[PDB]
Design an enzyme around this catalytic site. Sequence first.
Site, PDB file in Angstrom:
ATOM      1  N   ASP A 163       1.360  14.200  12.840  1.00 60.98           N
ATOM      2  CA  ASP A 163       1.795  14.157  11.443  1.00 60.98           C
ATOM      3  C   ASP A 163       0.653  14.021  10.443  1.00 60.98           C
ATOM      4  O   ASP A 163       0.725  13.243   9.490  1.00 60.98           O
ATOM      5  CB  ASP A 163       2.814  13.027  11.251  1.00 60.98           C
ATOM      6  N   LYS A 192       1.006  -3.359   8.852  1.00 61.00           N
ATOM      7  CA  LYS A 192       2.101  -2.402   8.936  1.00 61.00           C
ATOM      8  C   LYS A 192       3.318  -3.027   9.616  1.00 61.00           C
ATOM      9  O   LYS A 192       3.266  -3.396  10.789  1.00 61.00           O
ATOM     10  CB  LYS A 192       1.639  -1.167   9.711  1.00 61.00           C
ATOM     11  N   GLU A 244      -7.587  -1.745  10.298  1.00 62.19           N
ATOM     12  CA  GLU A 244      -8.736  -2.016   9.443  1.00 62.19           C
ATOM     13  C   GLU A 244      -8.348  -1.440   8.081  1.00 62.19           C
ATOM     14  O   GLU A 244      -7.575  -0.487   7.999  1.00 62.19           O
ATOM     15  CB  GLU A 244     -10.011  -1.338   9.970  1.00 62.19           C
ATOM     16  N   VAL A 302       3.453  -0.503   4.657  1.00 56.00           N
ATOM     17  CA  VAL A 302       2.085  -0.965   4.840  1.00 56.00           C
ATOM     18  C   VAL A 302       1.678  -1.852   3.671  1.00 56.00           C
ATOM     19  O   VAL A 302       1.882  -1.494   2.514  1.00 56.00           O
ATOM     20  CB  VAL A 302       1.104   0.222   4.931  1.00 56.00           C
ATOM     21  N   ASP A 308      -2.857   6.250  11.615  1.00 57.48           N
ATOM     22  CA  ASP A 308      -1.561   6.536  12.235  1.00 57.48           C
ATOM     23  C   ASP A 308      -1.594   7.451  13.451  1.00 57.48           C
ATOM     24  O   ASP A 308      -0.590   8.076  13.788  1.00 57.48           O
ATOM     25  CB  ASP A 308      -0.609   7.125  11.196  1.00 57.48           C
ATOM     26  N   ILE A 350       0.810  -1.209   0.000  1.00 54.73           N
ATOM     27  CA  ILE A 350       0.000   0.000   0.000  1.00 54.73           C
ATOM     28  C   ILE A 350       0.849   1.267   0.000  1.00 54.73           C
ATOM     29  O   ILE A 350       0.409   2.312  -0.479  1.00 54.73           O
ATOM     30  CB  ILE A 350      -0.951   0.018   1.217  1.00 54.73           C
ATOM     31  N   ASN A 388      -2.702  10.344   5.165  1.00 52.06           N
ATOM     32  CA  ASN A 388      -3.174   9.702   6.395  1.00 52.06           C
ATOM     33  C   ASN A 388      -4.695   9.715   6.582  1.00 52.06           C
ATOM     34  O   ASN A 388      -5.194   9.206   7.583  1.00 52.06           O
ATOM     35  CB  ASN A 388      -2.543  10.385   7.618  1.00 52.06           C
TER      36      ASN A 388
END
EC number: 2.7.11.22
Length: 281
Positions: free
Chosen positions: A120, A33, A74, A18, A138, A10, A125
């Site tokens: 971040d 991850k 998820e 990931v 994250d 990913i 994200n």
Amino acid sequence: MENFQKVEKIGEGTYGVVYKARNKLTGEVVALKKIRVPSTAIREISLLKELNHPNIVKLLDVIHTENKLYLVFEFLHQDLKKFMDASALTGIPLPLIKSYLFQLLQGLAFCHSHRVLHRDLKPQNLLINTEGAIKLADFGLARAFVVTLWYRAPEILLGCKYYSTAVDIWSLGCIFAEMVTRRALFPGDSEIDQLFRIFRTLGTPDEVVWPGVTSMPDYKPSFPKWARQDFSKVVPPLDEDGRSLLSQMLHYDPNKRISAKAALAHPFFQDVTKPVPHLRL
Ligand SMILES: O=C1Nc2ccc(-c3cnco3)cc2/C1=C/Nc1ccc2c(c1)CS(=O)(=O)C2
């Protein structure tokens, strides 16, 4: 690890790679991850799987074996960055922008009330699904452990080592402007360039607008002094309600910056709805 059949990569994250993976047992599709192991991290990460909210990407499992660490999240099919690229020509409809901002603020308010910061936030994200929902991914990893600086808060760039929940509001404010104009608000290519791009738009901060700023670790009296620009030129054609909220999210002084909780009651959200986006998977 052996229990998962990696499907695709990913993408590379801040703390690891990931992968889209299938739980060989349950058959469920997840986001695996691989963290690129301190006991502190273990405990910190552990508390995170207790945080459950509809606008937060759920941390399903934590695999700590053979001295390696794997986080199972998820899975959602698309992130906001890709969606924005796909909507580059027509831009994202205002009703959808408002819906997304509203949900993201709910997510942050929840995390902030548990004293968990993201630190971040960036388009990459923020994950979306076909139902019209958007979720923060994250969250809390920063504290547990070409980097983009575009969404970094001023206090972080100036050397403040004890940042607050306000840093996430700043990042969100930057993302909000980007959705509206379809162009990064402060695309700096280095720490000083980032700071200067912020100063050239919002004005160089002084003791009046930000008490204590000249005492920040990386502050220099030699900084150029630029005047503040009008928001009407920065984020057209956002209406007055929207510009009002944005300015409160981008206040220099972290203590004057609006909280996620208060932003939820802002007039900009009086007519909020939950549209379903047209996603191409
Ligand atoms: O569903 C997902 N859960 C995640 C948890 C963490 C992260 C992440 C990000 N940076 C570091 O960590 C990402 C996910 C995640 C990913 N799903 C996903 C799945 C497919 C695609 C994208 C994203 C991007 S695209 O170009 O739109 C294609």
